Each structure stands twice: as C-alpha cells, then as structure tokens.
C-alpha cells in the first residue's frame, strides 16, 4: 500500500547526507518507504557504473541520481518509459518553474515528457579559502591565475599547503574545467566542451590550460593521490591548507561545521569573463514493477520540486534552487552570489554546463577527457602533448 522507492545516489555523509535527510524526512511524512541505495564515490562516477550494472541486470531502482545527457541516453535505452512523473510535471506547471535550459535536461521522448526531477543548481567555478590563513599571510583573495600563483608561491614559502586537492579523475577534471573557463574564456569553453571542436581541444589555448594545470600540481601536497574531495575541504577548514578549487558542495561542509562566509572562510569564483559552470542534481525515474513504486516515484518528483523543499535542501547542500520562484533571502552570501552570477553569466553568454559533473557531455566523452586530464596532472607530460592526447581521445570516443 505505502508508496515505495529505491533511491540510488552518492550523498554519503557530511553536508550531502544532511541535505538529503530533508528529502527523506518529507518522503516519510507522506508514508513513503525509502529504500536507500547509496554508492559512495565523489562526483558520481562509481554510482554511474553501479547504476549501469543494475539496469543491465533488469534491477533498476525506482529513482537514480543522474546528470544531463545521461538522462536522455537511458531514455534511448528504452528503460524509462512510461513517463509517469510527467503527469506530475504538467499539473504543477514545471515549464514555468525552471529555466528553459534546465527544463531541456529533464525531458525524455525527444523533449516531449519530463522523466527526471531537478533539485538544485551547483556551481563549479569556486575557490574556497581559509580566512585566518589569508589574513595571517597578508594575502588578498586572488581574481586572476597570475594573482593566484603569486599568492600560492607566498604561502608555499611560508610552509603552508596552498591548494588542498584530492587527485581522483573527476576531481582533477573539476579543477581543469574551472581553469579552462578562465584561461580560454566562454567561447573557448563552449567550443571545447560543448561543441567538442577538434581544433579547439588540441590547440594552443588548450596548451595554456594545461600550463596552469601544471602550476596547480606544484601547489598540492604529497597526500593528494586518491584523497576524497571532502578531506581536501576539511584541510581548508582546519587551516592545514589555504585554498580549495571545488564546486559549492564544499559549502555544505563549511555550513555543517558552523563556519560562515566572510567571518570564517572566503568564497570567490575562479577567474572568468562573466562565466558560470552549472551542475543540476536530478533524479530519473525508471520503468519499475509495482503500483506502490509508481506512486513512490510521483511522490518523490513532487516533493523534489517543492518551493519550501528547495529552500531548505539547498541551504544545507550548498547549491541554489533549480526552481525560479524560491526566495533567496535566507541563503548565505556565497549562495546569493551564485544566484546573482548565474543571472549575469546567462545574459552574457557565459552560462555553461560543467562537463566534469555530467551536464555537458555523455559519460563516454566525460570519461575520455577526465582520463587525459588526470594523466597529465599526475605525470610530467608537456602541455602540448596533453592537448594532442585530449583531442585524440575525444575523437576516438565518438
Ligand atoms: O560528490 C560531490 C558532488 O558531486 C557532484 O557531481 C554532485 O552533483 C553533488 O551533489 C555532489 O555533492
């Protein structure tokens, strides 16, 4: 009788779990039976592999955390229809509650039916800094990479780890994409990671992106290989390191440890020309056996798109609402800056999808790029060799 749903996600511990708790509590308040299927692994690559295996085994969960064109790629597998939550989306008028771009991402049947619910917009192009460390070292928050490298050299010379970073493929790629946006610009990022333009992927602007990647390598510590993103954030909160380049799920950790922007830590975008790299956490609802699981799915979709839910969920998560009509008044200064910058970058053509977090590219392309980025980062590869390999690896993945 009760609505039921197995939910596959990678929100394991910390600020991620705290925010997810908001959803779990609302689902149980409507007598929903939550069947937890967590797959631990920053950024979701591991969940994506376990998710693919579940669907190949004809064991699809009722709901899965998923990104962008992976939604449409599963739809093309034929495993999502019928679109029982589009009935929810039409009655509630989702096309009037979401940007046209986010609405596109959520839709199946060649854009005809909603099949996924969005809960948020994360931003990738952020730098987090320990305020006491920067004040202690007479360092202004940098606004260019030249200013960042100079601040990093000064901190390094004072015995301080400048950049807390975990070297895992997706995590290298997260920094890489923020760097690319600033070194090359909005049109460059679009051409490379949205168009997959070969001349751009292997060109001299991409060489300069790998140039800066090589500099950032020198600013990380010996414990970086395989370190979890949230450990890196932890070292910034404890003042073991000065900076972290990471999306604003890092803010979920700062909040969960009772630190405030301005007073305890500084948040500033990575350099860009009115750029913004967006990331929408969303849940797809698969074809499933059982009327209780269909009602579970429609109940999750509705809850996930609620006005008050997206206010409370996102205060904990670190992101901003996907819903357009949610009051930002209660959010902190970093989230209000995110929402402001999103509006500005949208009007300037700088509002671009993160590829490291699944909005720009299907998983085959995302993986090809990550693999080249992490090999450059963890070796002594030249920048030009990396750009050649990047363009070849994208081309071969097509
Ligand atoms: O795992 C770290 C982060 O990975 C991203 O891809 C997800 O969109 C976030 O919700 C998550 O907190």
């Amino acid at each position: 009788m009760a609505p039921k749903a197995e939910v596959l996600h990678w929100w394991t511990g910390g600020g991620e779990a705290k925010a997810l708790k908001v959803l779990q509590d609302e689902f149980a308040a409507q007598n929903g039976v939550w069947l937890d299927m967590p797959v631990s692994g920053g950024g979701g690559d591991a969940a994506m592999q376990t998710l693919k295996a579940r669907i190949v085994a004809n064991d699809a969960p009722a709901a899965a955390q998923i990104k962008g064109p992976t939604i449409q790629e599963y739809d093309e597998e034929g495993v999502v229809a019928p679109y029982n939550i589009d009935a929810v989306a039409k009655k509630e008028g989702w096309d009037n509650l979401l940007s046209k771009q986010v609405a596109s991402h959520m839709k199946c049947d060649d854009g005809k039916a909603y099949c996924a619910a969005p809960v948020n917009i994360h931003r990738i192009d952020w730098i987090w800094a320990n305020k006491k460390v920067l004040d202690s070292n007479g360092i202004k928050m940098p606004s260019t990479w030249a200013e960042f490298n100079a601040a990093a050299d000064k901190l390094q010379a004072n015995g301080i780890i400048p950049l807390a970073h975990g070297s895992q493929p997706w995590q290298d790629a997260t920094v890489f994409e923020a760097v690319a946006l600033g070194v090359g610009g909005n049109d460059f990022y679009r051409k490379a990671f949205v168009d997959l333009d070969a001349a751009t992927l292997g060109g001299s602007t991409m060489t300069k992106v790998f140039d800066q990647m090589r500099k950032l390598k020198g600013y990380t510590d010996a414990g970086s290989p395989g370190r979890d993103w949230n450990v890196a954030t932890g070292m910034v909160m404890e003042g073991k390191a000065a900076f972290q380049i990471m999306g604003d799920w890092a803010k979920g950790e700062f909040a969960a440890n009772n630190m405030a922007p301005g007073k305890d830590y500084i948040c500033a975008p990575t350099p860009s020309n009115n750029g913004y790299l967006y990331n929408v956490d969303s849940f797809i609802f698969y074809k499933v056996k059982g009327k209780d699981k269909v009602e579970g799915q429609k109940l999750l979709a509705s809850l996930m798109m609620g006005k008050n839910f997206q206010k409370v969920f996102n205060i904990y998560k670190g992101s901003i609402p996907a819903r357009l009509d949610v009051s930002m008044d209660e959010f902190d200064m970093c989230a209000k800056k995110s929402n402001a910058d999103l509006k500005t970058a949208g009007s300037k053509g700088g509002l671009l999808p993160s590829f490291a977090h699944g909005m720009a590219l299907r998983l085959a392309q995302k993986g090809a790029i990550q693999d080249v980025v992490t090999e450059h980062f963890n070796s002594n590869m030249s920048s030009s060799d990396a750009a050649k390999k990047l363009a070849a690896a994208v081309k071969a993945s097509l």
Side-chain angles (χ1 to χ4, degrees), residues 149 153 210-220 376-377:
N149 294 351
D153 285 346
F210 282 116
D211 286 351
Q212 178 59 35
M213 272 335 267
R214 176 63 61 229
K215 290 284 293 168
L216 295 175
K217 195 35 174 27
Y219 299 142
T220 70
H376 168 259
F377 200 66

Side-chain angles (χ1 to χ4, degrees), residues 10-11 16 42-43 65 67 122 229 249 279 281 317 357:
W10 64 91
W11 290 334
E16 292 177 321
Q65 192 181 351
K67 301 293 187 62
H122 274 302
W229 75 263
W249 46 94
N279 170 39
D281 281 306
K317 194 68 183 51
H357 294 273

Side-chain angles (χ1 to χ4, degrees), residues 127-131 133-136 141 233-243 251 253-267 332-334:
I127 314 173
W128 315 90
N130 186 290
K131 194 219 205 293
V133 166
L134 290 198
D135 292 340
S136 271
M141 190 98 182
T233 305
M235 322 146 50
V236 177
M237 329 186 278
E238 300 172 26
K240 281 325 226 163
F243 295 113
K251 203 168 77 72
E253 303 301 288
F254 285 109
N257 279 96
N258 195 40
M259 331 157 60
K263 288 158 91 283
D264 303 304
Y265 70 90
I266 305 302
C267 63
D332 64 40
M333 310 165 35
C334 304

Side-chain angles (χ1 to χ4, degrees), residues 52-90 92-99 101-131 133-286 288 290 292-336 338-390:
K52 176 70 172 173
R54 292 273 306 260
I55 294 164
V56 157
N58 293 314
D59 194 11
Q65 192 181 351
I66 193 177
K67 301 293 187 62
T70 307
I71 292 159
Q72 288 81 42
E73 152 163 276
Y74 272 118
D75 191 43
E76 297 162 0
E77 280 320 78
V79 303
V80 181
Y83 311 118
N84 291 301
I85 69 104
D86 181 79
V88 176
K90 315 206 64 52
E92 289 179 357
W94 287 10
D95 300 319
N96 287 309
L97 298 187
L98 296 167
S99 70
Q101 186 57 78
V102 170
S104 267
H105 283 302
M106 292 311 104
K107 284 179 185 170
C108 282
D109 191 14
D110 309 66
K112 285 156 189 196
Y114 281 92
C115 52
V119 300
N120 67 352
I121 305 175
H122 274 302
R123 184 194 191 163
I124 273 54
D125 48 310
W126 280 116
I127 314 173
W128 315 90
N130 186 290
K131 194 219 205 293
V133 166
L134 290 198
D135 292 340
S136 271
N137 285 271
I139 293 174
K140 249 66 207 174
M141 190 98 182
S143 77
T144 69
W145 285 116
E147 289 173 355
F148 180 95
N149 294 351
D153 285 346
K154 189 175 177 189
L155 288 157
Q156 191 180 259
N158 206 34
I160 298 168
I161 296 169
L163 183 67
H165 175 74
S167 183
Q168 299 170 335
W170 74 272
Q171 231 190 122
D172 297 351
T174 300
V175 173
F176 171 80
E177 76 181 353
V179 173
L181 186 61
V183 172
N186 301 337
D187 300 287
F188 167 79
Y189 184 101
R190 193 182 263 105
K191 293 209 307 275
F193 303 128
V194 179
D195 301 339
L196 299 176
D197 182 74
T200 301
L201 287 169
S204 45
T205 294
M206 189 86 48
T207 302
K208 299 177 166 147
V209 176
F210 282 116
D211 286 351
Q212 178 59 35
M213 272 335 267
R214 176 63 61 229
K215 290 284 293 168
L216 295 175
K217 195 35 174 27
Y219 299 142
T220 70
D221 69 276
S224 266
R227 166 190 291 153
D228 282 343
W229 75 263
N230 47 290
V231 174
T233 305
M235 322 146 50
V236 177
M237 329 186 278
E238 300 172 26
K240 281 325 226 163
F243 295 113
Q244 188 193 18
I245 295 159
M246 182 57 59
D248 41 21
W249 46 94
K251 203 168 77 72
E253 303 301 288
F254 285 109
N257 279 96
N258 195 40
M259 331 157 60
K263 288 158 91 283
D264 303 304
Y265 70 90
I266 305 302
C267 63
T270 47
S272 70
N273 201 21
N274 296 132
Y276 187 111
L277 295 180
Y278 74 84
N279 170 39
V280 178
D281 281 306
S282 57
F283 287 80
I284 189 168
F285 306 94
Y286 286 106
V288 66
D292 62 346
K293 275 134 77 144
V294 196
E295 296 291 327
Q297 288 176 319
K298 289 162 325 197
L299 173 53
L300 274 174
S302 189
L303 287 181
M304 268 179 197
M305 261 312 255
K307 213 188 157 122
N308 181 69
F309 166 74
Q310 291 203 10
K311 155 180 116 148
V312 172
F313 176 88
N314 281 298
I315 281 167
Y316 291 142
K317 194 68 183 51
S319 39
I320 63 178
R323 266 192 80 135
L324 301 183
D325 66 345
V326 174
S327 190
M328 281 318 276
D329 288 359
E330 267 151 84
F331 285 68
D332 64 40
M333 310 165 35
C334 304
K336 294 178 160 160
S338 181
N339 179 251
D341 288 345
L342 183 147
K343 290 165 171 167
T344 300
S347 73
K348 309 277 187 194
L351 182 50
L352 293 158
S354 159
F355 79 78
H357 294 273
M359 315 299 306
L361 295 172
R362 295 191 178 215
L363 296 168
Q365 286 62 52
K366 160 171 149 68
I369 299 178
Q370 291 189 161
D371 287 354
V372 172
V373 167
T374 202
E375 181 189 355
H376 168 259
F377 200 66
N378 287 298
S379 74
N380 299 306
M381 201 170 285
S382 78
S383 299
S384 83
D385 280 353
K388 289 172 221 133
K389 297 213 193 234
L390 181 58

